[PDB]
Scaffold this motif. Sequence first.
Motif, PDB file in Angstrom:
ATOM      1  N   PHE A 928       0.817  -1.307   0.032  1.00 23.83           N
ATOM      2  CA  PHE A 928       0.143  -0.069   0.057  1.00 23.83           C
ATOM      3  C   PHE A 928       0.866   1.325  -0.159  1.00 23.83           C
ATOM      4  O   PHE A 928       0.545   2.226  -0.840  1.00 23.83           O
ATOM      5  CB  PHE A 928      -1.014  -0.036   1.085  1.00 23.83           C
ATOM      6  CG  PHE A 928      -2.042  -0.684   0.608  1.00 23.83           C
ATOM      7  CD1 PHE A 928      -2.413  -2.122   1.411  1.00 23.83           C
ATOM      8  CD2 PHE A 928      -3.316  -0.415   0.145  1.00 23.83           C
ATOM      9  CE1 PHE A 928      -3.503  -2.759   0.941  1.00 23.83           C
ATOM     10  CE2 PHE A 928      -4.096  -0.723  -0.072  1.00 23.83           C
ATOM     11  CZ  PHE A 928      -4.593  -2.074   0.464  1.00 23.83           C
ATOM     12  N   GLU A 929       1.992   1.559   1.077  1.00 24.11           N
ATOM     13  CA  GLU A 929       2.754   2.439   1.081  1.00 24.11           C
ATOM     14  C   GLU A 929       3.514   2.902  -0.349  1.00 24.11           C
ATOM     15  O   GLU A 929       3.659   4.008  -0.579  1.00 24.11           O
ATOM     16  CB  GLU A 929       3.405   2.668   2.506  1.00 24.11           C
ATOM     17  CG  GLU A 929       2.736   2.182   3.579  1.00 24.11           C
ATOM     18  CD  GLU A 929       1.559   3.313   3.863  1.00 24.11           C
ATOM     19  OE1 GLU A 929       1.601   4.257   3.375  1.00 24.11           O
ATOM     20  OE2 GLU A 929       0.736   2.973   4.095  1.00 24.11           O
ATOM     21  N   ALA A 932       1.377   4.092  -2.512  1.00 21.58           N
ATOM     22  CA  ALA A 932       0.845   5.539  -2.402  1.00 21.58           C
ATOM     23  C   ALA A 932       2.167   6.418  -2.661  1.00 21.58           C
ATOM     24  O   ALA A 932       1.832   7.606  -3.268  1.00 21.58           O
ATOM     25  CB  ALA A 932       0.642   5.563  -1.136  1.00 21.58           C
ATOM     26  N   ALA A 935       2.369   7.042  -6.581  1.00 20.07           N
ATOM     27  CA  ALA A 935       1.219   7.642  -7.131  1.00 20.07           C
ATOM     28  C   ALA A 935       1.560   9.238  -6.670  1.00 20.07           C
ATOM     29  O   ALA A 935       1.445  10.207  -7.500  1.00 20.07           O
ATOM     30  CB  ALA A 935      -0.112   7.304  -6.638  1.00 20.07           C
ATOM     31  N   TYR A 939       1.853  12.127  -9.464  1.00 18.93           N
ATOM     32  CA  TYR A 939       0.656  13.124  -9.526  1.00 18.93           C
ATOM     33  C   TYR A 939       0.708  14.723  -8.546  1.00 18.93           C
ATOM     34  O   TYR A 939       0.096  15.651  -8.963  1.00 18.93           O
ATOM     35  CB  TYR A 939      -0.571  12.535  -9.108  1.00 18.93           C
ATOM     36  CG  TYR A 939      -1.020  11.266  -9.729  1.00 18.93           C
ATOM     37  CD1 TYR A 939      -0.913  10.257  -9.376  1.00 18.93           C
ATOM     38  CD2 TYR A 939      -1.189  11.665 -11.166  1.00 18.93           C
ATOM     39  CE1 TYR A 939      -1.395   8.992 -10.328  1.00 18.93           C
ATOM     40  CE2 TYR A 939      -1.538  10.605 -11.950  1.00 18.93           C
ATOM     41  CZ  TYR A 939      -1.605   9.406 -11.813  1.00 18.93           C
ATOM     42  OH  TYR A 939      -2.056   8.163 -12.486  1.00 18.93           O
TER      43      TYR A 939
ATOM     44  N   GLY C  20      -5.847  11.428  -8.823  1.00 21.08           N
ATOM     45  CA  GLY C  20      -4.551  10.591  -8.473  1.00 21.08           C
ATOM     46  C   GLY C  20      -4.244  10.941  -7.267  1.00 21.08           C
ATOM     47  O   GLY C  20      -3.851  10.140  -6.565  1.00 21.08           O
ATOM     48  N   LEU C  21      -4.274  12.100  -6.615  1.00 22.08           N
ATOM     49  CA  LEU C  21      -3.795  12.618  -5.463  1.00 22.08           C
ATOM     50  C   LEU C  21      -4.927  11.936  -4.263  1.00 22.08           C
ATOM     51  O   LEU C  21      -4.415  11.587  -3.250  1.00 22.08           O
ATOM     52  CB  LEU C  21      -3.751  13.928  -5.107  1.00 22.08           C
ATOM     53  CG  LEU C  21      -2.674  14.657  -5.827  1.00 22.08           C
ATOM     54  CD1 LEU C  21      -2.435  16.209  -6.005  1.00 22.08           C
ATOM     55  CD2 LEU C  21      -1.060  14.016  -5.290  1.00 22.08           C
ATOM     56  N   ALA C  24      -4.047   8.155  -3.979  1.00 21.91           N
ATOM     57  CA  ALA C  24      -2.665   8.071  -3.174  1.00 21.91           C
ATOM     58  C   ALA C  24      -3.207   8.195  -2.065  1.00 21.91           C
ATOM     59  O   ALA C  24      -2.219   7.417  -0.990  1.00 21.91           O
ATOM     60  CB  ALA C  24      -1.786   9.065  -3.773  1.00 21.91           C
ATOM     61  N   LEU C  27      -5.190   5.210  -0.323  1.00 21.99           N
ATOM     62  CA  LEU C  27      -4.177   4.155  -0.436  1.00 21.99           C
ATOM     63  C   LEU C  27      -3.376   4.191   0.737  1.00 21.99           C
ATOM     64  O   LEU C  27      -2.809   3.218   1.452  1.00 21.99           O
ATOM     65  CB  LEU C  27      -3.360   3.921  -1.667  1.00 21.99           C
ATOM     66  CG  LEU C  27      -4.166   3.680  -2.779  1.00 21.99           C
ATOM     67  CD1 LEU C  27      -3.071   3.204  -4.096  1.00 21.99           C
ATOM     68  CD2 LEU C  27      -4.755   2.117  -2.786  1.00 21.99           C
ATOM     69  N   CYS C  28      -2.846   5.392   1.080  1.00 19.73           N
ATOM     70  CA  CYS C  28      -1.891   5.688   2.310  1.00 19.73           C
ATOM     71  C   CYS C  28      -2.895   5.556   3.423  1.00 19.73           C
ATOM     72  O   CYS C  28      -2.197   4.922   4.465  1.00 19.73           O
ATOM     73  CB  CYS C  28      -1.456   7.052   2.196  1.00 19.73           C
ATOM     74  SG  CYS C  28      -0.549   7.481   3.735  1.00 19.73           S
TER      75      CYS C  28
END
Lengths: 992, 268, 39
Positions: A928-929, A932, A935, A939, C20-21, C24, C27-28
């Motif tokens: 996951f990290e 993250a 991404a 972005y 996208g942010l 992210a 997911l974090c």
Amino acid sequence: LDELKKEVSMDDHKLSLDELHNKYGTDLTRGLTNARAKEILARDGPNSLTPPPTTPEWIKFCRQLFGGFSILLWIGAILCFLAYGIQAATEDEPANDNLYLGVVLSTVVIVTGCFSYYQEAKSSRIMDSFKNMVPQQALVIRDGEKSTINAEFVVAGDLVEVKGGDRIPADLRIISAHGCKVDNSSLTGESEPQTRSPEFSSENPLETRNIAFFSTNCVEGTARGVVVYTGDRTVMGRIATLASGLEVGRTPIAIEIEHFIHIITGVAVFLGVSFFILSLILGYSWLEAVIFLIGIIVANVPEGLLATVTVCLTLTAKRMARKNCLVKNLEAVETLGSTSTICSDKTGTLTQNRMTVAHMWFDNQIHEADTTENQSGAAFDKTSATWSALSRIAALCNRAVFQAGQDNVPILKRSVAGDASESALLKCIELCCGSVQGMRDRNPKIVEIPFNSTNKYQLSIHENEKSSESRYLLVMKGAPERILDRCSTILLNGAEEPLKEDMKEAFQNAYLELGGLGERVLGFCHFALPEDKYNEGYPFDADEPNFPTTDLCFVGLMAMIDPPRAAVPDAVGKCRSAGIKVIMVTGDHPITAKAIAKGVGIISEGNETIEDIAARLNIPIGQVNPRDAKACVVHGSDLKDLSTEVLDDILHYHTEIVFARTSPQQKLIIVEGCQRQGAIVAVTGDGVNDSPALKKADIGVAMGISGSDVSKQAADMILLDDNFASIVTGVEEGRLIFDNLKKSIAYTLTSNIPEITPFLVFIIGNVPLPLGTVTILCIDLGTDMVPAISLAYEQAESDIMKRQPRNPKTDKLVNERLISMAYGQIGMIQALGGFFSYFVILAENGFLPMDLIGKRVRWDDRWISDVEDSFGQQWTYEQRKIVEFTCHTSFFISIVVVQWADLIICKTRRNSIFQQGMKNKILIFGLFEETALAAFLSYCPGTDVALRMYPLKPSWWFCAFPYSLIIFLYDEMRRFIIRRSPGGWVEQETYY
Amino acid sequence: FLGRTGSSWFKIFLFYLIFYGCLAGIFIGTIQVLLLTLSDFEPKYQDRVAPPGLSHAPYAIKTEISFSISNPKSYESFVKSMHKLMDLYNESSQAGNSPFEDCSDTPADYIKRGDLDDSQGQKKACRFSRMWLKNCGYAEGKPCVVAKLNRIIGFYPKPLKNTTDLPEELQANYNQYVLPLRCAAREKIGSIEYFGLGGYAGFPLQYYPYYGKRLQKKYLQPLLAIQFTNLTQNMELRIECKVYGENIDYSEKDRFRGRFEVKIEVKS
Amino acid sequence: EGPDNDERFTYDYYRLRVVGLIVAAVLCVIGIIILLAGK
Ligand SMILES: *[C@@H]1O[C@H](CO)[C@@H](O[C@@H]2O[C@H](CO)[C@@H](O)[C@H](O)[C@H]2NC(C)=O)[C@H](O)[C@H]1NC(C)=O
Ligand SMILES: CC(C)CCC[C@@H](C)[C@H]1CC[C@H]2[C@@H]3CC=C4C[C@@H](O)CC[C@]4(C)[C@H]3CC[C@]12C
Ligand SMILES: *[C@@H]1O[C@H](CO)[C@@H](O)[C@H](O)[C@H]1NC(C)=O
Ligand SMILES: [K+]
Ligand SMILES: [Mg+2]
Ligand SMILES: [Tl+]
Ligand SMILES: [Tl+]
């Protein structure tokens, strides 16, 4: 240098008092002159220990900055500044590339330096602990007068005085003593007080009574002596130097690290210069030839790997801290797993270090008590009226008492004022009969005769607690045979009876058996004095026999020993099941050493020494074939006259070895002997006499509660709760981390290929650069970090305690099988998945794969702001570069996506994921990290400037998915083959 | 040997041969499917070429063209590239009704030859005479630079409307059919002279939209000759040629996004 | 469209970045939840 110190000492306890004075120019009565003492001070030097010269931390930090990877990263960092310099002079480049990349790389070296520096720690203050054993002051007789002086001002020849409670300031020749007893545990590991007197009593100076040693203390009485040795020249001052001086040496884990560093460094310099020349041949300007080289460096070196190792080690050490097992040196986390031989002290290590009642003989029957700390055994007897009679003597004929304010702590753990045997008896009765103080209040002691050297017994007369009697009871204890010669009746199951030869023989049998168990045996008897012959006011004379001491009633026997710790027998067996050889190395006497050896399982049932064979067969020991004896017991006095080659034969020819009555240097010698055969050795101990052995051991483990300060300074690991079961846990953890490091290393290396291949195709194909240098560092320093670490939390795939210890010569941390899989198979699949996404991005923007070959020339040309794509459109410089950097970004993300599968396959070396499961929460966290981070890096606005990361379109993320899946399937099929046929092909080729 | 025996050395070769063979076959397969999803006439994305770039013939060392008038081989470098471009706009290259067509000698409107389909032959492109480029070996003194708008399939360059104020305020404003190009430097030490189709300082809209290399080979894009007969000498002059339009924009990073960056210096 | 086909040369990189942010971040958060299932 220290070979002199590994030898047994020579002394002058054989000389007469007078003769000893001639040798040191001294007076037995007046002592030295103030002038003569000061003269000898300047002559010999101070009564002090000097710490050995250490290596400053400066040199220690910088020595890491030049170890393979750091060297290559330095060449890269400088080569960056090289290309930057060449630029700043030629064509004014307003960019920051080579300059900043050179700064970044130099920082990577420094920070990586801190990690390896943290791992290679050596917290050693051996000599400091020894210095703490020299008192601040000493009492000397100078010019016929006693005065306290700085103990450092003590010299050979002066007259010293010691008394109960003080430390021996220097090695002394006893010339006068009164009831002096000393604690020689520093030299033997045994704390039982040893008498000191002027008379010579043994050829061996470490055993004679007329020598007192520095590092020990006077426990009672008073003594005077002549100083024979000072400072470094004392017996234990030399042990200090030996221990503090011993070269540390490289750990098994450290050796493994350096080994794969050579391998990876090798391929790095190979491909490095192999393509540097390959570029010049293709007609590449040196300006570029170096830029490609820098990239090659960054691609080949796994920048985040050494730090991963350190973190995985640290995390393993944290888990062990949570089981009361402190690790002082991060590498010692693994050594225990590689250990093939344990050399263990007995007293305070295998044993509790406390005289404890082990057996009782009453009613013509052997009863066994519970010797364990926490009392994990069962009862023996409570019913027999005989027991209560024996119990009463054990309580009443006892002068030991519990220290004040102990009521909180358990009975067996509380401090007792008294000799060891009386304390044992106290704790025995207090445990199974409640408060002993109560029994001593109900039966007031009126007269007693304390244990005498001549009497060999102790007697007491008490007012019987019984109201219907309130008369006088006599109790006594002493040497079993002496007590027997004073008995006429035996309290059998309640009622007395005549002492016939029958019961007398059963006594001898019971006595011989208990003594054979290495136990100290005492006799117990009592006598109810006749009422009419002893009035309620009858006076008893303790000085002159005013009462009968014969025709008494024998009640029973009691036996005692310093017993094993509860967990020790089982821990020893577990070590042995894991194929670890366990040797006993003790300063204690052979009979005791051998008995505990059998008790804890060092010597298994049925195994014999040459002496055992000889006694059983009733034949001379020379007539016994020594190969028929798998067990041996070696006394230190014999060890002394054996060469190391002969010691090596003993080690080779016996499975069950006991080294008894060993000196501290002898322990070191045995350790070195084991190592000489190529074995990784652990030492377990708790005394200052374990210090040299603990230092020399590949890993020394000290006991935390019972351990002396010195021993814990010499060790790599401390058992804070004295839980010997922790050794078993330690070896298990050690093996697990070794396997998991392989997984983490393979995982980290695998992603090197997709970082190398783009640079190669860039040269051979003349296409636009698929991946950048900065992008590589975003992987090895960024995304791969948490996933790589998470592999340290992997459970065992099978019962690791069932396998033999690894062969450190054959079983390497990184072998050819790892490289084949990481570089040749999985990394290769990752490289393609990277390239695919690269071709996808370019082709969807108008540059089809076919037209890309040999275009870099025009692509990189900053002055061509009109490159034609496949569709006939024209691109400026910055426009096509945005697409190129977008290619770097998706290639980067492709690595992340293919590392998903790699993380899952590196989870297991043999087992399937469908068997091992996904119960590693840190690993899932990593997934996951990692995603993250990637991404965010793509972005987040502004990252296109700082890292040249560009936003990816949703479809871009899925390019590498089919490659990520092929990896999962491929490795799952491969491991299915491994399991289905332990034969070897897939195994001997790819099994990490 | 190093690692293994011959038998083992063979087996490791037989493996990696089949293994890498398969991987190559799979990689190629994924390239096949990628291509299968793409058109032959038009690229999937065009947002990265979107605002057209403006490029010129004089190959600038670093957005600069410095030379000496009193020296022959001082400018023969820039004449090489200048020739390379104009050599393509020859009349012998544009022969017959195929695939060329005579279009208005004056800036006109767009021309739609249908869709981006092969349902027709090669879409016929407008002819362009290099003879429309008056005055321009080339300018040995005071260069005669040639401008160009980057080709984009299906792009309709739209001129600005004379609703409000303009840089070249309303002069020769062929509002409906001309994409203007005005060069500039304050620092007014020159003499701007523009040459092009119909005599206008722009691009004739009759050359649009471009149908791509596959549907329009031999196609010719309009040129705009620019001459700087500056009365100054021996100094770096930063001259910027800017194009104006509804579909035209610029960037601080991309200094070629619809504009020039020329550093002329007639150091003679 | 015809001459008015400006949308062909346009892409909403702004929305893509916002989405996208968002992804992210989520997911974090999800990762923290799974990790913190025991610390
Ligand atoms: C395109 O036009 C140029 C115009 O300069 C042609 O250059 C001619 O080259 C020939 C032979 O080198 C000379 O004799 C002439 O003087 C040049 N000019 C003319 C007008 O003929 C060039 O050859 C042409 N290129 C092609 C491919 O046709
Ligand atoms: C980019 C492309 C062209 C490079 C391909 C490199 C190939 C040929 C390399 C990469 C990894 C390599 C293998 C890695 C591991 C081993 C195991 C060792 O015991 C013998 C050599 C062997 C078998 C190597 C042979 C060559 C090998 C397969
Ligand atoms: C350009 O050339 C023409 C002849 O074709 C000539 O009359 C004119 O003077 C030239 N213009 C300049 C500005 O030099
Ligand atoms: K050690
Ligand atoms: Mg001990
Ligand atoms: Tl790397
Ligand atoms: Tl890597």
